[PDB]
């Protein structure tokens, strides 16, 4: 029933909801369990970082396409441009994704530079310590200060473009001919009439001869 001025209620409590109720009294306990696992995992990968290298990628809709984030893995064309064989890459801490493509030059150039920055900071220990190979670090450079995150050392430096800048006066540009508002109205109008105008031109030319 209803008796006063109310908002019409819709509470979905007509099933046996009390059989499926999940409280979380183990929130602090599960946090301790996760930290112990991370600490154990880091110790197993002794000098290596605890992560993999990811590429930079742009979000997909008209909302969010102004921002960039990290993706799944590097493409096969990016790896070839840097000069890293595809079989070697996943064994030195680099992720690979075989189903992403480079439709532009902007994304390709950004990720190629990312790979060769990483390759310059890499230290390779030989498979057998008494017989080093010419592609390994010659062990005088094996001692340095290292990083073990790879998500803070190679993160997204700036996800958004700068929101403000300054130019000298008299260098400001001139507007479009009729004005910005009129340009938008004209672009919309042309799209709504592309089919009508093409048909009119076609029947005119056919009836011409």
């Amino acid at each position: 029933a209803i008796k006063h001025n109310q908002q019409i209620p819709n509470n979905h409590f007509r099933k046996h909801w009390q059989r499926r109720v999940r409280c979380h009294f183990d929130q602090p306990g599960k946090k301790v369990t996760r930290r112990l696992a991370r600490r154990a995992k880091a110790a197993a990968l002794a000098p290596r970082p605890v992560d993999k290298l990811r590429p930079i990628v742009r979000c997909p809709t008209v909302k969010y396409n102004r921002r960039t984030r990290l993706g799944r893995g590097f493409t096969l064309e990016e790896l070839k441009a840097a000069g890293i064989p595809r079989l070697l890459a996943p064994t030195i801490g680099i992720a690979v994704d075989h189903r992403r493509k480079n439709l532009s030059e902007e994304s390709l150039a950004a990720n190629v530079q990312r790979l060769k920055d990483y390759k310059a900071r890499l230290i390779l220990f030989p498979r057998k310590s008494n017989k080093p190979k010419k592609a390994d670090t010659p062990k005088d450079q094996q001692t340095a200060e290292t990083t073990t995150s790879l998500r803070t050392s190679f993160g997204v430096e700036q996800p958004l473009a700068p929101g403000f800048t300054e130019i000298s006066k008299s260098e400001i540009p001139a507007g479009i001919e009729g004005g910005a508002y009129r340009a938008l109205r004209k672009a919309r109008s042309d799209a709504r009439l592309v089919g009508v105008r093409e048909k009119r031109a076609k029947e005119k030319a056919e009836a011409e001869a």
Binding site: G163, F164, T165, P173, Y181
Partner: protein
């Protein structure tokens, strides 16, 4: 807390404040929104007019990301400049440069125009613009341009 309750005050009094003639039975009148068109019509017509019926056309599989375009008025255009730099322009100490403002980087798509603008030229980049907003920017000595 249970000690601040009228339940504690009713102890010792018959009927618990519910009446001797009417008795607080189980569900006199139905459950929920029952009787909306029959015996709860007086309530449903004084409040909530427009409750019953259909209006408009349908839209299968609507994606809300197609309709994203937040707007900002010219009234608050200068609040997007950092505070220290903003005071230099207003006091009249730059007089040689102009600021270039990116609306998309701040999370806006369309520029409406509601208030007034001080007479200092500015450069605005936007996806959409109102007719009045473009008039006031140009009259102050600025220009708006479209960026997608």
């Amino acid at each position: 807390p249970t000690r601040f309750s009228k339940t504690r005050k009713h102890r010792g009094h018959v009927s618990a404040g519910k009446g001797r003639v009417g008795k607080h039975r189980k569900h006199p009148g139905g459950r929920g929104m029952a009787g909306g068109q029959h015996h709860h019509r007086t309530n449903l017509d004084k409040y909530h007019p427009g409750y019953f019926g259909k209006v408009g056309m349908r839209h299968f599989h609507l994606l809300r990301n197609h309709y994203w375009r937040p707007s900002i008025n010219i009234d608050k255009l200068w609040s997007l400049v950092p505070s220290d730099v903003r005071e230099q322009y207003l006091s009249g100490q730059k007089k040689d440069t102009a600021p270039v403002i990116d609306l998309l980087s701040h999370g806006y798509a369309k520029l409406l125009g509601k208030g007034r603008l001080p007479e200092i030229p500015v450069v605005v980049r936007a996806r959409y613009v109102s007719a009045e907003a473009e008039r006031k920017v140009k009259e102050a000595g600025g220009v708006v341009e479209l960026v997608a």
